[PDB]
Amino acid sequence: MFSKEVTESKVFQWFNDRLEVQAISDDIASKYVPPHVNIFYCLGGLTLTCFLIQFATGFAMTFYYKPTVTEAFASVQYIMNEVNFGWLIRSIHRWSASMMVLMMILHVFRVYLTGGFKKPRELTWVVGVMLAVTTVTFGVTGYSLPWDQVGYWAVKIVSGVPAAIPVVGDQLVTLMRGSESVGQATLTRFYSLHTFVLPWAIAVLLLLHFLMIRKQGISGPL
Amino acid sequence: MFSKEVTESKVFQWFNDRLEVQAISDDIASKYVPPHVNIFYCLGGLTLTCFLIQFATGFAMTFYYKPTVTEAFASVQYIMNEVNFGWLIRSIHRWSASMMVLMMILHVFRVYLTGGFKKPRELTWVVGVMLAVTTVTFGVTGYSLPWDQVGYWAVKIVSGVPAAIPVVGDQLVTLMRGSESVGQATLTRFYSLHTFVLPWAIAVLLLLHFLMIRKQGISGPL
Amino acid sequence: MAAGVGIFIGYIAVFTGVTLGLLYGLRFVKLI
Amino acid sequence: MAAGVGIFIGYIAVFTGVTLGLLYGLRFVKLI
Amino acid sequence: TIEIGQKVKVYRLRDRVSPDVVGKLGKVGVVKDFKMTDGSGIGAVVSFDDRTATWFFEDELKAI
Amino acid sequence: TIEIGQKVKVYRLRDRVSPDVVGKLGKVGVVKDFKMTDGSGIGAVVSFDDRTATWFFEDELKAI
Amino acid sequence: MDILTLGWVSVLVLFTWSISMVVWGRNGF
Amino acid sequence: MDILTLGWVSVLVLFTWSISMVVWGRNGF
Amino acid sequence: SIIKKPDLSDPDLRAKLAKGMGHNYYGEPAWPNDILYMFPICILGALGLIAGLAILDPAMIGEPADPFATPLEILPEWYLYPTFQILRILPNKLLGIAGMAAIPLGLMLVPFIESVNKFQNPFRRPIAMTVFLFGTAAALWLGAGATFPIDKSLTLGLF
Amino acid sequence: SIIKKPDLSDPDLRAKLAKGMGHNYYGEPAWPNDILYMFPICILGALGLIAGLAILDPAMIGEPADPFATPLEILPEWYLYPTFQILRILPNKLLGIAGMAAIPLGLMLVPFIESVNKFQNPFRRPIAMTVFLFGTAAALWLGAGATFPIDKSLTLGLF
Amino acid sequence: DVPDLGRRQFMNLLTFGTITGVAAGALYPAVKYLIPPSSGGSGGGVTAKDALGNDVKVTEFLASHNAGDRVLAQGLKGDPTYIVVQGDDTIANYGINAVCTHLGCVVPWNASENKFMCPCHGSQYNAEGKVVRGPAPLSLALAHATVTKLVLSTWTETDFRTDEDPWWA
Amino acid sequence: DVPDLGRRQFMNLLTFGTITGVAAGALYPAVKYLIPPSSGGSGGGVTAKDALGNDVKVTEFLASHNAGDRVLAQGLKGDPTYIVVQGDDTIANYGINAVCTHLGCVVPWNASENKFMCPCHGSQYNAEGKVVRGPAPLSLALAHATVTKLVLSTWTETDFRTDEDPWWA
Amino acid sequence: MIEPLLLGIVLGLIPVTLAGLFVAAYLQYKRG
Amino acid sequence: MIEPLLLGIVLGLIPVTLAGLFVAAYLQYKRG
Amino acid sequence: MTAESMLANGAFIMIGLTLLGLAWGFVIIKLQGS
Amino acid sequence: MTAESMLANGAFIMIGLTLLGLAWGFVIIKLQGS
Amino acid sequence: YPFWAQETAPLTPREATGRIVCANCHLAQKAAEVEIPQAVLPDTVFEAVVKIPYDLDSQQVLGDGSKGGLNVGAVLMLPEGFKIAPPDRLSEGLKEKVGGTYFQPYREDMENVVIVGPLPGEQYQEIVFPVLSPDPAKDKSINYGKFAVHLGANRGRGQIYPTGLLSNNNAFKAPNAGTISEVNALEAGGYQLIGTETVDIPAGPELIVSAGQTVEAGEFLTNNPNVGGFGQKDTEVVLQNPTRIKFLVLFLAGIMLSQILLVLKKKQIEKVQAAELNF
Amino acid sequence: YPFWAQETAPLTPREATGRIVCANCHLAQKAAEVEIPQAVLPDTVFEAVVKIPYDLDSQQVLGDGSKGGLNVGAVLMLPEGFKIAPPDRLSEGLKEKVGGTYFQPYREDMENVVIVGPLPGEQYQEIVFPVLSPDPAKDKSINYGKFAVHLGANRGRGQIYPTGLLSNNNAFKAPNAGTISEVNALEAGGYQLIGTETVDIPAGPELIVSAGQTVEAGEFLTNNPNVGGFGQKDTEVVLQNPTRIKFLVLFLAGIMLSQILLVLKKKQIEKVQAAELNF
Ligand code: FES
Ligand code: FES
Q: Which residues in chain I are closer than 8 Å to K137, comparing Cβ atoms?
């Protein structure tokens, strides 16, 4: 991983002396991509690319977006209109949400049609499905943040379906909405989930997933 | 790390066939705490404890706190009064910010007075100083979130300080305030920094710090 | 704060009594 | 659009020309 | 598990194959290389007398 | 450079020391144990004739 | 030349070209 | 007995006791 | 490119291959061949294609939320089109929620059910490819149904 | 606890100890002695003391921010008391800013300057303990000065 | 007598059971915190508010509708409840909660057909709000509508349409 | 021939230089985005508002505060600017910006002393706003005031206190 | 609302990716 | 504003922790 | 042309341009011939 | 007592109870049988 | 007609729910389409072909009673800033395509919304609306972005007048459960049907209940002669900045070239690695 | 006096800056203190000892230019819900301690804020304010928490009347640059200094410029006889719920016991490990 020039440089020797960074190089270089791997094994990684764009542009939109029922739509139209390149950042964010979910579906098709999930990699698939759920949760929580007609009514519909359970469902609806009715509490809670809870949940699930693929490696040849 | 009972159970045998979790146990059990370590080596760990409380109770206060200039003080007094145990969660969070910084100062005193920073642990100390800066940034961004008088004026003072830079000061003030004057843009930006940017920065710096501690181990006997 | 000092004495005496009671009792039943 | 297919063809053709110009050129000067 | 350069006889064919490959069944061919197979087993490419080198699962072929 | 049981003789004292160690300068001892000193050094407990064992840095002692 | 057509064809061409550069670099599919 | 005094003494006692349990468990300071 | 050959003489690689792992030990080098050079080709492909889709088809600022007026047609994101159709067409709400929850848990059960067979190739997994292709056609049919009116949702107005 | 002794025969441990590392290879076991048992002792101590401080001394809802009325005495958090005093006492604002930034950057250089001496004990580095005790007394003096009027800030009203 | 598995597991039950009791004590305030405060209001007569923040005056409404069409106003549980005029002079004593029961799409009122007609999935209701047809299993909730300030109270008596105990109560 | 170190590093310069140009192209919109948009093209004629945010009319301000009194009204750069009356008939054509120059602490007005007196560090200013005493090196910024709508324009002309170029300009 | 372009990209990529994974599978399954 | 209790705990712990670390250091430094 | 049509045409162009992607990469591989 | 009084006495209580904790845990070490 | 929409709801044809007011009276629900470009550069005349497709041969009950041809109108609610291109901006080709269609704004100060109709349906199965996109450069209020274009296109007569009465083109229904004691024409197509509540129907639809069968309240007395219907189609048009696409094409060409250079650097590292393996 | 604050600023003594109105006329600044408990249970009479320390032998100039004793007043701004305990609620110790001090609310509907004074300073160096904490349980508006208790404490005569004139207890200063002329005792002790602008001063102050030195505008003409001053001290009182501390004590005892059991399990595992090493 480190070329001879970097290995001999006194700076790298300093780092090697203290943190033995060469061991990282050896671990990265020991791996090999088997011949059976093809372009479709890129899809999982592209699912991460779309997430990292979503991580960056979301960080961009937190600086201007105001998660309030009086200011959320005005702040989203401010991002679009007034903010410099806020049209680009918001459009890229919507498009990378759709492309993250599409790349994820294609990745589940690759995995499934290559037997990636088969023993010993059952837990990688299960953490996968959890990741997928977390991503659809990101999509739902985000859809409602603009507090536009489409978003507000999508959260109205989806958050009221837990009511189907006779007794417990009412409590789940009051928890999801954070109030008896979709309102300011629902927007504060969906925003806290979207921008804080769910990035940490999907980052813990991404670390679990990538640690299990690193340990076990890639699946065998078809 | 796994008793004789957990080991040999079909469940642990399953997880160990797949992910080789036994290697984690071996690595955790191989380490030893040298005799010179004493109660004061606890202080850095307690700095993490105070951070984890700050991570949990902060997650709690994101569900109710509304980062708007018209609703931030009303939402903080709603957390205190109306929300169940929101007085407890907010008071614990305010107290754990002070106790995180105090535990960090006491941990800098331990480290510096134990020679922990000396070669080869120079980079652990430098990431330490980065952590410290990030923690004081958490304190400053948080102090202003209630948008009370002390908070609003503390952000007014601190955010107008970069103005004194001769050439580029004014743009740094406009950048950190997010507006010509401390206002709603400054509260949206301080909240984005507080609940999203700074937790990720301090978590990357905490992971770097703990990885360097683990690789290098603890400092030598005094 | 004389009463507070009394309560502090009482807390350290109660808890140290519980600690040594538990330690010697468990050692007696050979648990520890 | 037919104009779009013409521009697409031109785009691809020029990019193939640059990729293979660079490939054979760098191979010639031995950079590859 | 399987010796290189070892004559093998194909007792069974796991998968449906073209007629030519089925002709290979029951023919002695010196294994020429090892190919990783579907089940992560070590399958063996088999060079037959006619030189139609076709890979086979280790389960299929039997050491000769 | 030092092994256990090895007879040693302290010749220098890197840090300030109590009167006992003042007297121990130029004394005959036998290594009793390996101290873990600062600077990540391998120190050595030394049992002298006095019968009181004092730890020393590696540089201080002279193997003989 | 319509700039809207050129924008759509640039995006379409970058999708085609990224697929072709990935099969070229990796030497197959 | 003053509840307020018991409230402050519980916290002071838990600080003392946590220090004493850490030096007891580790068998020294 | 230089391709490492699996060093099968090594008993450690044979043991790993027995368990299904150890395929990251042979083939082309991971770094820098694939990770350093080829991965940024895909990262730049995706960044450029998402930026081009953003520029060409920017995000649309909707109408301000009216709690008193429900859009004639309210729809979720496209990935929740089959999830949403299930809700509307199934009369009992509770079976709708059971189906919504049965999608992810059934997916979580895919590996345990299917690992009876060891063969990863789709052509050596007949029943699993039958269930998968039927379920993909059913999820695409439900998703297409979500957009249609509730009267013509189940037939896509085709018949 | 029965304490492992450093196996100095091992050349790997000797090499690690030469470089300053390898102190996590001897002493009492890390797990479960300290990690499992003692760490939750400190975690529960801190959680209980923070909950007791929160209950006994809860947070104060201040007054709402008035942009037109500056509080007579605005103060930051206690950890920025020495920094805040730096700002007000120094006549030139830019000099104050340079001092504020010199606190963290000055800290970042501590290891490089100090590593000239290999000894970790404070009593073996007199100059470093002199500079440290002077700097801790100066930071506590600045912090105490921050909480006084600017007229009596530098003397704490003592002189 | 070195502690065997049984004694070790009993001491693990003692220690970690007590730490689990303390953990549950610390978690209970957090869980109760996350549960929204039960502060919807009185839970009885919640004055019907206008679409705008202002609370609608009964008489001002009685001078605005002109009997052309049914109007909506924030209701119990924050669901827009229709206020019928039924003669213009005095609002009807009952207000039909205009939230479809199938999923919650606010049902508009087609005064041409004299029946609510939800566009969301096409669940019809009559003037009284009973489901004449459509997927919606239950009927639209009713509320009390006094002519005084307006107070909206859940229909505690048997509904006069289906003549059964109200599901919403 | 096999590419030598120089050739390898030149091809690395080609590839990663172009990837750095593409990265800078993608990063520039992000950095410009984070830079806040300018409130307006020119910060001139910034109608004086209030802390509550309502626009402050010159006539209403004149009616209140009698004479020789100072009341803050939001001004240029979102800083409260005192508006002098000096006769209760026409507001003075100038409005002292009551923001301490060295810090941000808003400066109150003591009409009894006829001198501004900042409470943070005691930085005083005379009636005209000039620095008389205290740690603040610069003076309070000035603006125009119009007696006919109230608008505050960046005071660009030479200040009539120190008779030097406006520092704030 | 329905985004037609996005569902065109979706219905285009899903079946071409499925066809290509079944083709890669068939070619690996083939015996030369 | 000044929180006198918090400042008390800060000014109590800082010097007791400093004294304790200098005592630990002296105890390691001194030779038995 | 219209946004609505990009549902159908956009899908076929995708199918069309993925394979044309694939194929052209092979063309480059064949063309380079080294 | 008063809130303001808790600055000095609270600091002395901190020093005192840190040293008393150390002492009492050494006491507990001794009170156990080795 | 479209002008009774101006009368009934002068503020805006679209409600907050997104239901154009046309539906309040045109009860049936036929199709409707708009062929608006996915994107339109600023200050450029484009065309929005509003298809209002009904069967040509179908005949509807004219107000008098005798069947006749349908007409077609529409309310094309363009985004803010858009309007109908003036004739001078129209090209000769679009001068021909549009013809003599009169387009009027739903109200002054609302030029974006345009109400065509009523137009004879035989030759207006497709109404080309010549739009002129706004320039965000000239007008600050206008910005570049995706904007919604809502159409309400209707063919045939309505069912309910602005007065609230019911038109002859409507399936009448029973007021009360009353037996049909009398049914008479009186040299007209109106039928004074007979609780025996006497009700009158006009000379539009033919009776399905002409027999003396008893009637119940609600049951349709006549067939529904409405062969037309209102439809609404919400689309989107991206007002695209040309500079955005110039810099996009430049950025994507940079990415393409960098990908070429990435594959070539991989070729170089592969050559080095192949020479390293050789001994 | 305190009632001139009621008149001047009836709404509230404290400004938005937190400056009590006292200072606006009591220009000097001396120390003021409040001995309020750190926490007070609900519905409990406690004491707030407002210390107003001034040197007792110090003599101020009186309205009539005659040295005399100072007086002491104060504005104790308690939190919302707090009040002055009525005499019935007072204990005998506090009944006698408070004595006959009359405490009045700054205004009706503002019982929390209490004004005392003017009181002879000789016997009122410390004014015990008998407070009565509110019960959040009985009063929904009031809640348990940390609250701010502001204080004003003037210890001497002011300098400027509500009329805006200046009192004799003040350092009078030059209006304009002149030179003293025809200096005489205009009043009984007042003076008439003489741009030669004739200015008059009251008897209180003593001239520092009586000599024929020239005068400049804004130059203090006399000594400052102001020996008193106003001070303000903002403190805090925690209205504490007793149940909060009951459950806190129980939770912390749980934690303490669990820590004991953690050390005991460490002892057990140390025994197991020590016997495991032995063979
Ligand atoms: S929600 Fe109205 S019909 Fe389903
Ligand atoms: S900012 Fe004005 S005196 Fe400090």
A: 91-93
